[PDB]
Design a protein around this nucleic acid. Structure first.
Ligand SMILES: [Zn+2]
Ligand SMILES: [Zn+2]
Lengths: 49, 269, 214, 269, 213, 49, 49, 49
DNA sequence: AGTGTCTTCTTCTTTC
DNA sequence: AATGTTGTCTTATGCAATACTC
DNA sequence: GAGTATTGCATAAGACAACAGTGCACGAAAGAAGAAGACACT
DNA sequence: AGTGTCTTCTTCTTTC
DNA sequence: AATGTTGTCTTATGCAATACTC
DNA sequence: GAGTATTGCATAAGACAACAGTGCACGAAAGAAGAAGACACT
C-alpha cells in the first residue's frame, strides 16, 4: 500500500500508515506494524516521499 | 556551473531563483535539480470530499441535539431536518436520555409521515438496544456517521445556527434579555415554528412546505460532460438536479446515479 | 381551499393521567384533529393550543367559538385581533359548538382506551408515556383512513401531486422576439437548459439569454 | 399595498423579498420598510490600517522574544529586524530578564549601524527602570504599542515563522529528531543567519545585505489619484514607495508624507 | 577585499576563566572580530570561523598558523566542504601578517581602559562581560583608526545612495523596442517610466515594456 | 465639519451635519445643534452642496 | 459622540461607550459611568443601529 | 489500470506502469512484475493507450 | 460445604 | 498614550514550430 | 501560399497559510469487567 | 506611655 | 461502517431612458 | 440630428461568517502598597 500521512486532532502529521480501500470521500487506513484499521475522512491524508 | 549547485542545496536549501542567479543555470534546470529532500519538497495534495445527500422527499432525515443557555431549566433542544425539501422540527426536553428520543421521533413522524432512513451521530442515546429494538419494531433503516467528524451533519449544523438567531431576535425583541419566564416559551416556540417554514427563506422561489408536499422530479436530462479522475471529461451521463454545488449525475449507458461536486460538470453542446 | 372554519372543545376524563382536561380542535373542510394536554381551565392556556394548531395546519379564517368558559377575556380578544381571525361565538350544541366534535371525541376516546389496553396498565396510565402515546393516536387518525373513503384528510387537505415540467420561459433574444414559450430545466452555471413545448428538444441557451415570460 | 407589512415584520421578522411577496410591494419599498427594526439589519462595521515604516535604513528597528522547544538547555530566543531593508539578527538566552535585553542590544548595534527607534511591545522586561537609564545613556528614542494587541509587530511576527521553519529543516538534515547536542548547539544559528541574509528571498531582485548598505531614495513621484473619505479621488499627490499592500504618498505643497493602504491609489493620465 | 583573512589565538587572564581569545582581521580595510571562547579546541576554531563568515562574508585564501589543533582531518574536511584556499603560514612571522599583533595591543589597551573606567580594578564579574566585549567591536569598527578619513566599514562596503532605476526596454507603436529609458515605481498594472535626458514621466502598460539588456 | 446631502422621505438637502466621522457603510449622522445616534447608510447619500 | 459595540477579549459585541478622538487606525473610547479612556485599534469598533 | 508512461530522470516515455484511481496533483502508479507503487507529479505522466 | 454459577455490587471506558 | 504580512503553490493567457492544404 | 491550426513555451494574476508565555480541565449517559457474597449440586 | 518613620517583610497586580 | 453549507452583503456591468451639444 | 453624458435598475457574481457538550487553567519577572519589629521623639 502507498504510504500516506495522517492528521490527528492536535494538528500534527503522523507517518507510518498505508491505505487499503478508498471510496467517494472516505478512506480505509491501517498502521505500518500495529494494524488498527479504521476509516478516515478524505481531507486528512497527505502523500509522502 | 552545475556541480556546485548539486551540493549547494544539500548544504543550505536556499531556493531555485537564488540557485539560478548564483550558478548561471536556467530556471527549468534549477527547478528540475531541486528535488532531493522531502523536507524542502512539501508536495501537498490534501484530496477533497463533499456532499452526501438523498433525493426523494421522504427518504432521508437528520436529527441532533443542542443546548440553549437562555432557555428555561429544560434547556436541551432536539432538532430534525428532511434533506430533500428543507423542513425543520424542534422539541424541548431538558435531559438527554434514551427515552427522550423515542418520544421525540414519535412527535416528529405525526406531521411528516414515515421516513425510510436515518443517519445521525454515534453518541450515547442513539446506540442503546432499547432504541434499537424500538427502531426495528417501527420498521425504519438506520445508520451512523464516522466517529468524530462534525461535518457529516452539516445540513443540520447549519440550520441550528439560523434557528438560534431567529429565537434570539424573537426573545429580545420584546424586552426579555435574560432567562425567559416559564409561561411564554411554549407560545413562543410555536410562532418560531410558523415563521421558519411558511415563507421563502433567502432567495429560492418556493415555500418549503409546498416543496415537500408537491415536489418536482424529472426523467432524462440534457447532455453533459463530467471530469472523472481520468484527467478529462467523459460522456454518457445526464444531470437531473444541480443547485449551488452538489451536482447529481445519472448514467446513460445502463444504470447508476452518483453525487459529485459541481466542478466536474460542463453543459455539453 | 379546505381552510374555512375550525372548531375547539374542552374534554374531561382525567382517567388519562394528570395534565388532564384535554383540548381538541377539528377542521370541518378536511376533518383533521389536534389535541393537547392542559393543567387547568385558564384563559392563558388557550392561545397555546391555538398557536400549536396554527403552526401545524395554517392560518384559519373562521373559528367556531365555544361559549361561556374563558373565551371572553380582553387579553384573548386582543390576542385574536392581533392575527386578525374571525371568531363566531354562536350557540353551542345544536348548530355550533358540539355540532361536529361528537364523533371526533368518541373516536379519540376509543383510540386512547384501545391503545391503553393493548399494552397493559388497566388502571391509571403511568405518567411517563403521555406524548409518546398521544402521537400514535394522532398519526393513526390522520394517516390511516377515517371512514370508508379514498379521501384521507392529509390527501384531501394538501392535494399531493408530482411534477415533471417547470415554469414557462421566453427566449426573446434572437432579434427581440420569442417563440410561443418553452420549458426551463436544470439551471446550471452559465447557461440554462431549455426544452421545446412540442418538439421536445434540449438547447443550452446562455443564462443571460432567457427571461421569465408573463 | 403598503399596509399590514409593518406589523407583519414587527411580529414575525422575515426577509425583504418574502415580505414583498404575498403583498405586491416593490423591492425598494420592502427595503425601506424593513430598515426600521434595529434588532435586525445594521451589519457592516470594521476598518483596517498599516504599520508606519522608514524610508532610510536604521530608523524603525523591531525586537521580540520566542521559545524553541527543541532548544533544550536555553531556548528563549531573541530576534531583531530592520523594517527598512529586511535583515534579521538572533540571540540565545536562558531566562527572560531585563539584563538579557541589554546584552542583546549590544551585538545588533555592533553588526548594523545605530538605530533611532526601537518600538516594541510592553512586556515586563522592556518597561523596567534599569533599561530606561541604559537607553538614555546611548540616546535612542522609545515607544510601545497598544496593550494586548499582537498585530502591531507584524513584521517580526511573520519573520518568526520563516526562522522556525528554516531552523527545523536544517536540524533534520543530518538526522536529529530530539534536542540538539550542546556541542553542536553552537555553529548552527550562524548558518541560518548566513542563509537568510546573503541570498535572495522569494522572488525579489537584491539581497537584504546590499539593500541595506546601498538603498535607493527617490526625489519625486508621478501624479497619482488617492481615495479620500468621499468617493472622489484627489489628485496632486506624489507616491514615494509602493509595495504589495502599502503606499507612502506625499503632498505637493506641504510635505506631509503618510502611509496608506495600497487600495487607495491609481495612476494619473 | 576578503583576500588574506588572518586569525590567531591569544591568552588573557583579566577575563572570565576563559583563558583564550580568537581574533580575526581582514588585510583590506582592516576590521576586527574576536570571540570569547575557553579552552583551545578544533570545534571552537570551526565555531569562530563560522561566526566570522556569517558576520563578514565568504572569504578565500585564509592563512592562520601552522601546528596545534589545525592539522585535524575533520577541520580539513569541514574547510573543503565550503571550499576555501588554505595557507599554512607561520603565525606572526613578521612580513605582512604582523597587523594581528599590531591590533592585539590596541584591543588589549582599549578593553583594559573601558573595564577600569566603570570600576572593577581587579577582575570583572561574570555577568558583565558580553556587553563589555561587544562595545569594543563598535568602538573599533565604526570610527577612524587613528589617521584615516574613512572608516574600515566604509572602505569595506563602499556605501552609496541611489535615486534612479536600471535601464528598461520600452515598446512603442511600431512593434520594435525603443531604447534609453529608466523604470520607476511599479504601480498596479502600469510600470511608469522616465526619460534619460528629457525628464519625462509616462505610465505604460506592463506588457508593453520589458527589461533591458 | 462639512455637512452631508441625504434622503429620508422627500429630500432634506439642508445643512447642520458633519463628515467628521465617516464610514464606508454609514456616515454617523450628528447635528451641530442637537447630535444624532442613528447613523445613515453611505451609499444612498452624497456630499453637501 | 456616536457609541460603538466594542469587542471584548474572548468575543462579543456590547453597547459599551462612544469615541472621543480619532486619527489613523486607532481611536480613544470613553466609558458610560466610570469614564476611563481606552485606546483601541479601529478594526474592533462597530457602529450602532 | 491502462498502461501509462512517465518521465524518469533520463527523460523518455516507457511502459510497464499501471495507474489506479488518479488524483489531482500527485498520483500513484504500480509495476507489473515487481508490483511497486510510487508517487509521481501530474505533468510527468501520460496515458499510453 | 467447595465451588459454582447466580446475584449483586462495584470500578473502568467512550462518546459527546 | 500609538495601525498585517510575505514565501509557495495554483491557474490563465498570448506568440513560435511543425503540419497543412486546397 | 495563405489561411489555419494546433501545441508547446513564457510569462502574469491570485489565493494560501501561520505567526503570536504553555495546555489542558470537567459532567453525563450507557455499557462492560470483574469481583465478592449467596443458595444449590456436590 | 503614644507614636512612626526606617527598614524589612509581606502580600497583591500586570503583562507575556 | 460511511463524504460542508446557506442567508446576507457588497462590487461589476448594459442598456433603456432622460439630458445634452454643437 | 448624430455623438455624448448620466442614471437606475437590473441583474449577476462573488465573498462572507458560524455551526459543532461546557471553559478555562498555570509560571515568571518586575513593581507597588501595606504592615510589623525598631529606636528617634515622646
Ligand atoms: Zn532542500
Ligand atoms: Zn425587525
Amino acid at each position: 500500500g502507498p504510504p500516506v500521512k495522517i492528521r490527528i486532532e492536535t494538528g500534527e502529521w503522523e507517518k507510518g500508515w498505508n491505505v487499503l480501500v478508498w471510496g467517494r470521500g472516505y478512506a480505509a487506513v491501517k498502521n505500518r506494524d500495529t494494524d488498527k484499521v479504521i476509516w478516515v475522512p478524505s481531507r486528512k491524508v497527505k502523500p509522502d516521499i | 556551473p552545475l556541480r556546485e549547485a548539486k551540493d549547494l542545496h544539500t548544504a543550505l536549501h536556499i531556493g531555485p531563483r537564488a540557485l539560478s542567479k548564483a550558478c548561471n543555470i536556467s530556471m527549468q534546470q534549477a527547478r528540475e535539480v531541486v528535488q532531493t529532500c522531502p523536507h524542502c519538497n512539501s508536495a501537498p495534495a490534501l484530496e477533497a470530499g463533499v456532499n452526501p445527500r438523498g433525493l426523494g422527499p421522504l427518504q432521508i432525515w437528520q436529527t441532533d441535539f443542542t443546548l440553549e443557555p437562555r432557555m428555561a431549566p429544560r434547556s436541551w433542544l432536539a432538532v430534525t431536518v428532511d434533506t430533500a425539501s428543507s423542513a425543520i422540527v424542534v422539541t424541548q426536553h431538558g435531559r438527554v436520555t434514551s427515552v427522550a428520543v423515542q418520544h421525540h421521533w414519535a412527535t416528529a413522524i405525526a406531521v411528516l409521515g414515515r421516513p425510510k432512513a436515518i443517519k445521525t451521530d454515534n453518541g450515547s442515546c442513539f446506540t442503546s438496544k432499547s432504541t434499537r429494538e424500538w427502531l426495528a419494531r417501527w420498521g425504519i433503516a438506520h445508520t451512523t456517521g464516522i466517529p468524530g467528524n462534525s461535518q457529516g451533519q452539516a445540513m443540520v449544523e447549519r440550520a441550528n445556527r439560523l434557528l438560534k438567531d431567529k429565537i434570539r431576535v424573537l426573545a429580545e425583541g420584546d424586552g426579555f434579555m435574560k432567562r425567559i419566564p416559564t409561561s411564554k416559551q411554549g407560545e413562543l416556540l410555536a410562532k418560531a415554528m410558523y415563521a421558519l417554514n411558511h415563507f421563502e427563506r433567502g432567495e429560492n422561489t418556493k415555500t418549503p412546505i409546498q416543496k415537500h408536499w408537491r415536489p418536482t422530479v424529472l426523467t432524462e436530462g440534457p447532455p453533459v460532460k463530467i471530469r472523472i479522475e481520468t484527467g478529462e471529461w467523459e460522456k454518457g451521463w445526464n444531470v437531473l438536479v444541480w443547485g449551488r454545488g452538489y451536482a447529481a449525475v445519472k448514467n446513460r449507458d445502463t444504470d447508476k446515479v452518483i453525487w459529485v461536486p459541481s466542478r466536474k460538470v460542463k453543459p455539453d453542446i | 381551499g379546505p381552510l374555512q372554519i375550525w372548531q375547539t372543545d374542552f374534554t374531561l376524563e382525567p382517567r388519562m393521567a394528570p395534565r388532564s382536561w384535554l383540548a381538541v380542535t377539528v377542521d370541518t373542510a378536511s376533518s383533521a384533529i389536534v389535541v393537547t394536554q392542559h393543567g387547568r381551565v385558564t384563559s392563558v392556556a388557550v392561545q397555546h393550543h391555538w398557536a400549536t394548531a396554527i403552526a401545524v395546519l395554517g392560518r384559519p379564517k373562521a373559528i367556531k367559538t365555544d361559549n361561556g368558559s374563558c373565551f371572553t377575556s380582553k387579553s384573548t380578544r386582543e390576542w385574536l385581533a392581533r392575527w386578525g381571525i374571525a371568531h363566531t361565538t354562536g350557540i353551542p350544541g345544536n348548530s355550533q359548538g358540539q355540532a361536529m366534535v361528537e364523533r371526533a371525541n368518541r373516536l379519540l376516546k376509543d383510540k386512547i382506551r384501545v391503545l391503553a389496553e393493548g399494552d397493559g396498565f388497566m388502571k391509571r396510565i403511568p405518567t411517563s408515556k403521555q406524548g409518546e402515546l398521544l402521537a400514535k393516536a394522532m398519526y393513526a387518525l390522520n394517516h390511516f383512513e377515517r371512514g370508508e373513503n379514498t379521501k384521507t384528510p392529509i390527501q384531501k387537505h394538501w392535494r399531493p401531486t408530482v411534477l415533471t415540467e417547470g415554469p414557462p420561459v421566453k427566449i426573446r433574444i434572437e432579434t427581440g422576439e420569442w417563440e410561443k414559450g418553452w420549458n426551463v430545466l436544470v439551471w446550471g452555471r452559465g447557461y440554462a437548459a431549455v426544452k421545446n413545448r412540442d418538439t421536445d428538444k434540449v438547447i443550452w441557451v446562455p443564462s443571460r439569454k432567457v427571461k421569465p415570460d408573463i
